[PDB]
Design a protein around this ligand. Structure first.
Ligand SMILES: [Zn+2]
Ligand SMILES: [Zn+2]
Ligand SMILES: [Zn+2]
Length: 245
């Protein structure tokens, strides 16, 4: 998903997913301790820095190949043979964040948590769970799709307090894998012969630009709603794990 502005949701789908996940936690009045939400807001600059840094510098963006932002659940791999993938990378930063939190280094903790949230957010994008990059056929569709999502994402906010609490076990890798399983199932609702066809014809015809955008909207909304619920669960897991128990 996009992460083009550090502190603005307009062109940062990753930050929008996290902010909507925090709103789910705030809406929950049965299980969530609201001081957790206050801690995320207190260290929001560092959290947002971590969410943005993943797509912009080393080691996180893998020398501009973004290999660690992809993870196919069926084979456990990213799109480049032998490169690091999103499950081991997102789990690495979940644990580094927790160790920093226990040592009371909040700036370090929330930056590493933002990184981990970014990787979990990416495996909820079906193209990232299927190794479909901006060079895959049809080339340029991955990037135009992610730009398009920013223009519609406000229509898919989750407005209830039901995150996926304890969705998977206590291992963060299980959450990243589980989210990629669901996202790859939804891959054909976005990438298929029709959307490929219309995207290619969209260069010459505006009518086709609208056609592929409309076609991918329903599954995009579904994926964005699941990403908010899974992210809220994952933040709650992090505080349950390192927050003193
Ligand atoms: Zn992304
Ligand atoms: Zn992407
Ligand atoms: Zn990314």
């Amino acid at each position: 998903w996009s992460a083009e502005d550090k502190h603005k949701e307009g062109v940062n789908s990753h930050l929008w997913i996290v902010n909507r996940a925090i709103d789910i936690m705030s809406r929950n009045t049965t299980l969530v301790k609201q001081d957790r939400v206050a801690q995320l807001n207190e260290w929001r600059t560092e959290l947002e820095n971590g969410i943005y840094a993943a797509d912009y510098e080393n080691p996180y963006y893998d020398n501009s190949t973004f290999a660690s932002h992809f993870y196919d659940p069926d084979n456990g791999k990213t799109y480049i043979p032998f490169a690091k993938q999103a499950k081991e990378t997102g789990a690495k930063y979940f644990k580094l964040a927790g160790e920093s939190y226990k040592n009371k280094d909040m700036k370090q903790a929330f930056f590493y948590l933002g990184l981990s949230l970014h990787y979990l957010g990416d495996v909820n994008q079906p193209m990232h769970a299927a190794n479909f990059t901006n060079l895959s056929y049809p080339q340029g569709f991955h990037s135009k799709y992610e730009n398009f999502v920013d223009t519609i994402k406000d229509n898919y906010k989750v407005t209830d307090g039901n995150g996926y609490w304890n969705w998977k076990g206590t291992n963060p890798e299980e959450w990243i894998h589980g989210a990629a399983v669901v996202a790859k199932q939804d891959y054909s609702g976005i990438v298929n012969d029709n959307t490929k066809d219309w995207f290619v014809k969209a260069a010459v015809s505006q009518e086709y630009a609208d056609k592929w955008r409309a076609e991918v909207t329903p599954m995009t909304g579904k994926r964005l709603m699941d990403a908010q619920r899974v992210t809220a669960g994952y933040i709650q897991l992090w505080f349950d794990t390192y927050g003193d128990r």
